[PDB]
């Protein structure tokens, strides 16, 4: 029925894989988008 607020102060370091002395993983890719004018309100997730 909801969420509980939390606290974090995390940070990460990214480097070119060829010059990295330690590699937890590789960033294949990230992207962003927006929902637009949805009829269920601004504070409503858009599955599409």
């Amino acid at each position: 029925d909801g969420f509980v607020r939390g606290e974090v102060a995390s940070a990460i370091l990214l480097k070119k894989a060829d010059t990295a002395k330690r590699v937890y993983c590789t960033l294949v890719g990230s992207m962003l988008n927006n929902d637009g004018n949805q009829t269920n309100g601004i504070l409503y997730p858009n599955s599409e």
Binding site: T39, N40, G41, I42, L43, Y44
Partner: protein, 1379 residues
């Protein structure tokens, strides 16, 4: 970017929602002992300890305002506590609600040992020696305290209310209130007391039981005790000490009741004495003649001056002028009317419209564009014709209600359909709606106005506007066939060219059995013609067999009636105005196909109940034309109210009634018997109720009583001045004085201990003091006065100057009300007027000098040569004080407002020099007086000013000086000082000495008498006001703009000096009073309204009650009430008998005459068996008929015989609105209630006293038939009017709201819900926004959609999903609530 801010969440499920269950006269209130908990919790919070581990003590808690709670709202209050001293303040916003001092402690604060008591001492007692929660909170409800289940803590108590069982539920605001209820339960009465000061409140949770376990359903009861010696209400760990309350005016939860006069009204040709007759006064018959002469000669002026021939219908005007001459200067004509209009002789018509409008018609110049301009001019003042005495004579409230309700009784539907054709020229909705249709509760009505165009004036009325041609038949829309139950044609058939065609087409719009109402000019047809000549276009109308239309648009009344009769129309009603208009109510004849059934219901033993039941069962299986005629040929018969209740379960289609009153039936009584002649005339009209009384057929109708008649003033031998509304000096009136009975109201309690010898004096002049103004304007409540005046009729006036019983001229002070025409002055307070003063001068002496001697010689102990400082030297007490002080050879310093007062005093007292005067504007007298007294100070200070003036006054006192403070507007701290005995209250001491009349008073009596002889006591200058300017006199005293005594002149002093006072009458409002030396029987007085009405009589004079019941005292509420009457000094007697046989009747009157002469008989007894008429046998049908048909004729037979007949004053027989509206299942009760009303109407016929209240519903002792139950305190207010009135039966009922239409109401609900939806979004005006814009386009977001859905479910039957909500429109919302 003071102390704890408390938020009270009055929400649906908030834990403190129980606080909405505490209301006073409807308003929701925060409990007075609710700010104590807030202060208690705040102090604990400051200390850091838990509030339930802290023992506090609040002292001198002042309640300044009332915190009005609001449902579904948040109230924020700030509590501020001073750290060390404890001064606390509960303040909402910037307004104080509570103030006081809160102190915590670790020791034992509680005084009484109640916290140690464990059990309940009310164990094993009988149920008649205990008060239960229903009985405890019935008493509070009667006083306006409405407590819900949360605040109903006192679960049981003793008759004395000393011992109680208090519920502990863990809510402290509830618990503290329930401990304050014990104090309230210890002061029985009728008024509403608002707490204003709690001297001490001790809360010690340590000795208090812990909060009940979570989810507890049954809570424990803690013993409680009330201590009269110390005035402590203690229960558990709480103690409330010396709570002081202020009388509060009880506000009306609902709108004022609608009082009506259930009277008989003839149908056709009413005589002038009948209630259906036109209200043509002699003045109106003159205005009609004056208008006729003005109209006649004006036309003559028109014809001769019309040299341009710009006056079409000229032949018509000539014809109109001719007839006026047949049945018969312009300057004089206007002169006569102007004299009538400008005169203000009381006889004054409400307005003169016909004259005004006629003047515009004739005075307008004859030139180009005349008729077009003048047509527009009259169409701009059309209202004058509508609202004119001549036109309004037939539009009186009585006739309009008679017609509308008579039709309603006969239409056999649920919705009454009306249709006013031609509503632009002659309107009727503006009269029918506000006068008759707005009083409907059982039957709905639909009104439809129609005309050629839009009816402008009907925009504000709940009517539907149609459109078609009224002046031309054959074009009436076919949608109007069988469309209206009633058709109104006010001034319509006079505009039709072809009457027969119009009437034939109009008759089609009438439903089968509908009515047609026609209002047309029938007499003096040439009076209104000048207006119609130039307001009508085609003044031409074909005549016919009945004759030729006058001019071309008027038929005579006789011709009107013949014309209607020719088309087979039965004349249901016909009321000729006589001076102008006439009214006809017609419906088509009814031709039965099956012989009507007649059942005689004369027998009062109900030997016909079987026959009616059988024939009533076969109603819904017979032909539609079959009728059941319940016929009664006796004055006493309940057929009228019996039928009304039968109609509620069998419909009005077939039930019909006929009653013939034998007593008033004319020399030719009707002969209704099967195949008779009169009956057939009645089977043709087919009217539901036919009553032959006073020689004419009619019906019983409830005619409304105007709110102005409730305060109508009538001559009365004894009157006294009181206020209609407390705290208003403009509401002062003269009411009937109980001295007509010889005694004075308020002989209960302490007034019974002092048996002072009193002389009855005829007051001639009454002096007005500042004590009366303070009480009249609400500055001080009646409760501050001596306790002997609590039950007195009034508290205004003490001094007077009149004539004693021997005719001697006397003046003196008496306990109030002395602002009356007769007084009972103790012989120890009466001085004799010297034979040099007129009674006018004597009226100024007594109080002014009695107070002066008390302040100076009795309280100040003035000695010869002493220095005295007198505030307000120009006041009557000030002038008396100076005169007394001068006689003692004192050094006087006085405060004068302006130079006029200084000049007046200097002239009045030559010994006074300018050095003896100071100013009341500022405290600069302190330095002057101190310097002038060489630092010695003033021996006596008569103080009236307050604030810094009071402080500076005490600072002038010498070492032995006395400070006499007699000001009335004391501060809150000063009053607490009075309560705590810290200081003496000397401002109502002269009033207190007048109640005791003991050694201290006789000292003042001798001092004043000596002063009169020695010349010290001289009369003061005065202004005399008549008895009708009482209000102005009070305002004059209050303003204090000028010095002098204000003296009301009651009577005119005779030239002689010892002569009897002539008997005279004064106009005064009614006030019922009961003789204290007579015995009053209250049969059934041991019940709900019986005991509460009995308490009302006890306050109004009754002191000899014999209450009768079938069982006597059977509950603790009855035992507690009767023990309250006896304590007050009332000789009560409770008889466990039923007055149903002559033996029982004799016993009740043997006991009554033993107590004293019988002076009143009341019958409040009721027995009800509610059941369907067909499932009731005789033994069950005669159940309610004993208390209403056998106990009313055994009390009426005994009241018509000696010695009761001469002594008896009141004969009250309570009734019900079932006799006027009917009810479902109460067909036996209706028969009993109607026969009771017929006995009471027979008593009026014989000149005996009789009163028959007809109550709808009573609250304190919900919505039934759309009528709110009245509060009892308002039932007794109208009951008092009922007793002091000439009518027999009075109907009192409260309407939920003035009736609207059917569609009108439906649209109202639609707009209501639409607005609720709009506000959910946040739109102030729902109609402002577009109706085709979706909600999502506005910003609806998740939370609102759910709110909208819930609101729709709670408001209407719609259940809409959230998704569709954000995509539907307002127009869609409206159309779907419609579906």
């Amino acid at each position: 970017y003071s102390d704890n801010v408390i938020d009270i969440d009055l929400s649906e499920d908030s834990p403190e929602n129980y606080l909405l269950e505490h209301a006073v006269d409807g308003r929701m209130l925060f409990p007075a002992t609710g700010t104590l908990v807030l202060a208690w919790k705040t102090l604990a919070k400051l200390k850091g300890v838990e509030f339930e581990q802290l023992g506090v003590q609040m002292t001198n808690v002042q309640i300044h305002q009332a915190l009005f709670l609001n449902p579904g709202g948040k109230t924020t209050v700030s509590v501020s506590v001073m750290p060390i001293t404890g001064e606390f303040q509960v303040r909402d916003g910037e307004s104080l609600i509570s103030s006081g001092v809160i102190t915590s402690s670790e020791g034992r604060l509680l005084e009484t040992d109640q916290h140690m008591k464990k059990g309940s001492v009310l164990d094993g007692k009988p149920d008649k020696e205990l008060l239960f929660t229903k009985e405890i909170y019935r008493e509070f409800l009667l006083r306006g305290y409405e407590y819900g289940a949360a605040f109903q803590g006192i679960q049981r108590a003793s008759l004395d209310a000393t011992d109680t069982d208090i519920r502990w539920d863990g809510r402290w605001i509830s618990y503290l209130d329930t401990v304050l209820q014990m104090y309230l339960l210890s002061k029985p009465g009728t008024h509403q007391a608002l707490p204003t000061l709690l001297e001490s409140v001790t809360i010690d949770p340590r000795v208090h039981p812990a909060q009940p376990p979570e989810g507890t359903t049954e809570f424990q009861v803690l013993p409680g005790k009330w201590d009269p010696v110390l005035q402590i209400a203690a229960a558990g760990g709480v103690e409330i000490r010396s709570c002081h309350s202020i009388r509060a005016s009880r506000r009306l939860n609902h709108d004022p009741p609608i009082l009506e006069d259930f009277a008989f009204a003839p149908y056709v040709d009413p005589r002038p004495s009948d209630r259906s007759a036109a209200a043509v006064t002699p003045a109106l018959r003159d205005y009609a003649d004056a208008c006729f002469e003005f109209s006649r000669q004006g036309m003559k002026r028109w014809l001769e001056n019309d040299k341009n021939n710009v006056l079409p219908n000229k032949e018509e005007i000539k014809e109109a002028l001719a007839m006026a001459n047949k049945h018969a200067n312009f300057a004089s004509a206007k002169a006569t009317l102007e004299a009538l209009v400008n005169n203000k002789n009381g006889h004054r018509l409400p307005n003169h419209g016909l004259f005004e409008m006629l003047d515009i018609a004739f005075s307008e110049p004859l030139e180009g564009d005349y008729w077009d301009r003048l047509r527009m001019k009259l169409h701009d003042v059309r209202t004058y014709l509508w609202d004119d005495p001549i036109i309004a004579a037939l539009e009186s409230p009585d006739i309009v209600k008679l017609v509308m309700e008579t039709v309603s009784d006969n239409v056999n539907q649920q919705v009454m359909e009306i249709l006013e054709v031609g509503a632009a020229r002659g309107p009727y909705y503006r009269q029918a709606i506000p006068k008759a249709l707005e009083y409907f509760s059982i039957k709905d009505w639909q009104y439809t106005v129609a005309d050629q165009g839009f009816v402008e004036d009907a925009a504000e009325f709940p009517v539907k506007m149609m459109q078609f041609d009224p002046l031309d038949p054959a074009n009436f829309p076919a949608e109007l066939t069988e469309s209206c139950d009633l058709l109104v044609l006010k001034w319509n058939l006079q505009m039709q060219v072809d009457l027969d065609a119009a009437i034939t087409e109009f008759s089609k719009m009438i439903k089968p059995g509908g009515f047609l109402l026609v209002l047309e000019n029938g007499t003096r047809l040439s009076t209104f013609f000048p207006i119609k000549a130039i307001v009508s276009a085609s003044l031409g109308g074909k005549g016919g067999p009945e004759g030729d239309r006058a001019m071309g648009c008027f038929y005579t009344d006789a011709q009107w009636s013949a014309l209607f009769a020719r088309h087979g129309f039965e004349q249901i009603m016909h009321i000729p105005d006589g001076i102008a208009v006439s009214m006809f109510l017609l419906r088509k004849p009814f031709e039965p196909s099956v012989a009507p059934i007649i059942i005689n219901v004369d027998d009062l033993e109900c030997s016909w109940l079987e026959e009616v039941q059988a024939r009533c069962a076969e109603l819904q299986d017979s032909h539609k034309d079959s009728r059941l005629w319940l016929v009664a040929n006796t004055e006493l018969s309940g057929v009228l109210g019996f039928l009304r209740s039968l109609v509620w379960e069998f419909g009005s289609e077939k039930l019909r009634c006929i009653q013939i009153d034998d007593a008033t039936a004319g020399p030719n009584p009707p002969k209704i018997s099967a195949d008779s002649a009169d009956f057939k005339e009645l089977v043709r009209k087919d009217l539901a109720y036919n009553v032959f009384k006073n020689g004419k057929w009619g019906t019983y109708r409830g005619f409304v009583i105007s709110d102005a008649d409730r305060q109508k003033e009538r001559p009365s031998e004894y009157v006294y001045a009181d206020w209609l509304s407390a705290g208003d000096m403009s509401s002062l009136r003269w009411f009937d004085s109980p001295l007509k009975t010889g005694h004075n109201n308020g002989m209960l309690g302490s007034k019974m201990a002092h048996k002072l010898e009193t002389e009855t004096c005829s007051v001639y002049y009454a002096g007005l003091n500042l004590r009366d103004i303070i009480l009249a304007n609400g500055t001080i409540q009646r409760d501050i006065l001596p306790e002997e005046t609590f039950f007195k009729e009034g508290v205004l006036g003490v001094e007077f100057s009149g004539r004693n019983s021997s005719g001697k001229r006397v003046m003196g002070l008496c306990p109030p009300p002395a602002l009356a025409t007769t007084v009972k002055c103790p012989v120890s307070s009466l001085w004799s007027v010297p034979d040099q003063w007129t009674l006018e001068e004597a009226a100024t002496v007594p109080l002014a000098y009695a107070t002066a001697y008390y302040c100076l010689v009795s309280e100040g102990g003035v000695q010869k040569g002493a220095t005295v400082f007198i505030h307000a030297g120009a006041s009557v007490v000030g002038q008396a004080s100076i005169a007394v002080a001068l006689s003692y050879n004192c050094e006087i310093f006085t405060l004068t407002k302006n130079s006029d007062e200084t000049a007046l005093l200097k002239s009045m007292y030559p010994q006074l020099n300018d050095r003896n005067f100071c100013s009341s504007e500022d405290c600069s007298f302190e330095k002057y007086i101190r310097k002038e007294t060489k630092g010695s100070g003033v021996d006596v200070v008569i103080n009236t000013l307050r604030g810094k003036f009071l402080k500076a006054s005490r600072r002038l006192l010498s070492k032995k000086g006395k400070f006499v403070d007699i000001g009335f507007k004391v501060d809150s701290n000063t009053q607490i000082a009075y309560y705590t005995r810290e200081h003496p209250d000397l401002r109502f001491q002269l009033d207190a000495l007048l109640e005791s009349q003991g050694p201290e008073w006789t000292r003042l009596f001798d001092l004043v008498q000596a002063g009169i002889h020695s010349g010290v006591v001289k009369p003061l200058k005065r202004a005399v006001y008549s008895m009708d300017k009482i209000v102005d006199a009070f305002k004059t005293v209050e303003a204090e703009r000028e010095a002098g005594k204000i003296v009301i002149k009651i009577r005119d002093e005779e030239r002689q000096k010892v002569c009897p006072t002539p008997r005279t009458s004064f106009p005064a409002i009614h006030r019922t009073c009961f003789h204290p030396d007579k015995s009053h029987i209250l049969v059934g007085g041991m019940g709900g309204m019986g005991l509460e009405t009995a308490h009302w009589m006890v306050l109004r004079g009754a002191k000899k009650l014999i209450l009768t019941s079938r069982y006597g005292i059977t509950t603790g509420y009855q035992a507690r009430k009767i023990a309250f009457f006896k304590q007050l000094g009332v000789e009560v007697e409770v008889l466990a008998l039923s007055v149903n046989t002559r033996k029982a009747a004799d016993k009740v009157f043997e006991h009554a005459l033993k107590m004293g002469p019988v002076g009143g008989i009341f019958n409040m007894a009721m027995v009800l068996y509610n059941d369907d008429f067909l499932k009731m046998n005789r033994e069950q049908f005669l159940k309610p008929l004993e208390s209403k048909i056998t106990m009313t004729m055994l009390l009426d037979d005994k009241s018509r015989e000696k010695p009761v007949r001469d002594t008896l004053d009141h004969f009250v027989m309570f009734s019900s609105l079932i006799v006027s509206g009917g009810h479902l299942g109460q067909a036996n009760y209706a028969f009993g209630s109607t026969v009771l009303e017929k006995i009471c109407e027979r008593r009026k016929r014989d000149g005996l006293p009789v009163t028959t209240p007809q109550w709808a519903s009573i609250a304190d002792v919900t919505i039934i038939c759309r009528k709110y139950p009245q509060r009892f305190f308002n039932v007794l207010s109208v009951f008092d009017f009922m007793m002091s009135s000439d009518n027999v039966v009075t109907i009192s009922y409260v309407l939920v709201e003035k009736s609207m239409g059917v569609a009108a109401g439906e649209e109202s609900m639609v707009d209501q819900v639409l607005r609720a939806v709009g506000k959910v979004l946040g739109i102030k005006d729902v109609s402002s926004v577009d109706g085709d814009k979706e909600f999502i386009d506005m910003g609806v977001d998740s939370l609102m959609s759910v709110e909208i859905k819930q609101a729709l479910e709670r408001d209407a039957g719609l259940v809409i999903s959230t998704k569709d909500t954000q995509l539907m429109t307002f127009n869609t919302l409206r159309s779907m609530v419609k579906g």
